[PDB]
Chains A and B, each alone.
Chain A
Amino acid sequence: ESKTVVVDDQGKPRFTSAKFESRKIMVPPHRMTPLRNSWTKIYPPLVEHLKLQVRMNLKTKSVELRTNPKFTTDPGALQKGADFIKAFTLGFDLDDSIALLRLDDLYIETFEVKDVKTLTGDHLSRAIGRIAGKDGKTKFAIENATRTRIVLADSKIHILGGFTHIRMARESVVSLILGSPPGKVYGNLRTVASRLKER
């Protein structure tokens, strides 16, 4: 640009006109085994629709995601991919973690049986069998009702979905932990599913 002033009328001058960001996420080996098993379908939703550089240090058991400034100008995408890998590593399935990528209002809540009501040993065992139900039937009922997804660890219980959805699922599973019979659980279940289907 050359430099020269143009003096307009009333003496007025006249001119003429003239960063990566990364995140790291660990993975446990029991979760790394299906990660290695189904790694192939993990990156195609993100590297193509979010344009996020991926690396995975099996030396460090972690995954790295880098936003390039010219290739990507999208603020929440690295964060969304972080939520995606967090959900999967927490134990949720690939399609529901992708569902979390599709939406932005999908939220996770985890909690513990000792946080709600501490129980011991075989009491905890019978309680886990109760909250599971016969062959996860009750868990499926909860998931279908609240439209939520549940992950049942030893004590960590993870619930993915909408805010009030996981709220309702939390109230239900708190009832199960405290000792609710599954029939009255089913009664309240079709009640809450009735109002949620009516809305």
Chain B
Amino acid sequence: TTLPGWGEWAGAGSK
């Protein structure tokens, strides 16, 4: 249930 989004910047460039 690891969610990119709420945690940090979820994008095509980096994380």
Contact = CB atoms under 8 A, between A and B. Distances in A.
B13 A55 contact: no
A55 B10 contact: yes
Size bracket, chain B contacts: 10 to 19
Secondary structure at chain A's binding surface: helix, strand, loop or mixed?
mixed
A54 B6 contact: no
Secondary structure at chain B's binding surface: helix, strand, loop or mixed?
loop
B9 A68 contact: no
Interface of B: 3-6, 8-13
Size bracket, chain A contacts: 10 to 19
Interface of A: 39-40, 43, 47-48, 51-56, 58, 64, 66, 68, 71-72
Contacts of A55: 5, 8-11
A182 B5 CA distance: 45
A51 B12 CA distance: 6
A135 B4 CA distance: 38
B3 A54 contact: no
Contacts of B4: 43, 54
